Amino acid sequence: KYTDKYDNINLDEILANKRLLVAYVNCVMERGKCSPEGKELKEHLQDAIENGCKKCTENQEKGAYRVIEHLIKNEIEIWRELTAKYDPTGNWRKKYEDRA
Ligand SMILES: OCCCCCCCCCCCCBr
Ligand SMILES: OCCCCCCCCCCCCBr
Ligand SMILES: OCCCCCCCCCCCCBr
């Protein structure tokens, strides 16, 4: 499994604060520096997409759905950029949008 050492991160505060959210977005989109957490996400995001979170902790799976639903509803443009870069064949795009 991926490490659980950052699993207590406060996702609600990241989603509530645009400056914070965009810092992570810029890290993963390679246009900004990465915090230790952001870096750990950037290094495992493609793998997780390729195997449907096979190595994710329960908290990470829960967290992913939370963040993805927020991006789809409130930052559609950021969702489009992320899904296109990290999921180019669209393995999960329609699935998450349908759930959202
Ligand atoms: O232990 C799980 C690590 C995840 C920490 C980073 C969460 C950042 C959520 C914001 C992402 C926005 C799109 Br990049
Ligand atoms: O279908 C799965 C795609 C959702 C993206 C999973 C995010 C990966 C979380 C891994 C945790 C990295 C440690 Br910070
Ligand atoms: O089509 C799939 C694209 C998935 C992009 C996911 C980015 C957000 C993942 C945040 C993970 C938080 C773990 Br706590």
From TrEMBL:
Keyword line: Signal
Cysteines joined through disulfide linkages: 27-34, 53-56
Name of the featured protein: Chemosensory protein
